[PDB]
Amino acid sequence: MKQAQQMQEKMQKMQEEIAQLEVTGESGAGLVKVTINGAHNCRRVEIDPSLLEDDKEMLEDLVAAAFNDAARRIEETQKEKMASVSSGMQLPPG
Amino acid sequence: QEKMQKMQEEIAQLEVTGESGAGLVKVTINGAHNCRRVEIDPSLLEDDKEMLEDLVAAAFNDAARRIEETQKEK
Numbered sequence: 001m002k003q004a005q006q007m008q009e010k011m012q013k014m015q016e017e018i019a020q021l022e023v024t025g026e027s028g029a030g031l032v033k034v035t036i037n038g039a040h041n042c043r044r045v046e047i048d049p050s051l052l053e054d055d056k057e058m059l060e061d062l063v064a065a066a067f068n069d070a071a072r073r074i075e076e077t078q079k080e081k082m083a084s085v086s087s088g089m090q091l092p093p094g
Numbered sequence: 095q096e097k098m099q100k101m102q103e104e105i106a107q108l109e110v111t112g113e114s115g116a117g118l119v120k121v122t123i124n125g126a127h128n129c130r131r132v133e134i135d136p137s138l139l140e141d142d143k144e145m146l147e148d149l150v151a152a153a154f155n156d157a158a159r160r161i162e163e164t165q166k167e168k
Contacts, residue, residue: 052146
């Protein structure tokens with residue numbers, strides 16, 4: 001606990017680094033973009049004005065596809081942050 | 095001390111719908127963060143584009159906060 005607390009509090013700092021990464025998913029090549037952080041909080045949705053005229057249900061599915069594109073991207077980003085932390089030996093050794 | 099092999103997986107299959115604007119937008123997701131459906135009220139398409147974008151983000155985040163609340167207690 002001068003040797004087994006600072007695993008748990010190094011763990012917390014790493015959760016915070018992750019939580020702050022972001023990505024931007026898109027559907028229709030950018031007709032909808034969703035920006036989300038490493039804790040799955042949605043920071044920004046952007047919707048092209050051409051989608052508000054017609055097909056509500058088109059707009060709806062493109063929104064959902066954007067979110068799912070952002071979820072896949074954020075999982076990629078997290079996996080790269082785990083690669084980087086581990087290869088970097090960035091934890092207390094043990 | 096551990097039974098989370100099968101409890102983060104209960105979360106993962108589970109579905110909540112977040113809402114904003116008092117029901118005007120609803121966003122259904124799972125604990126695996128897949129978005130199943132988005133429902134947007136026709137009134138929002140007229141002129142409030144910035145409003146509509148903020149309400150979408152708020153409904154997703156309501157969903158995400160119910161999923162978090164669900165595994166807070168478990």
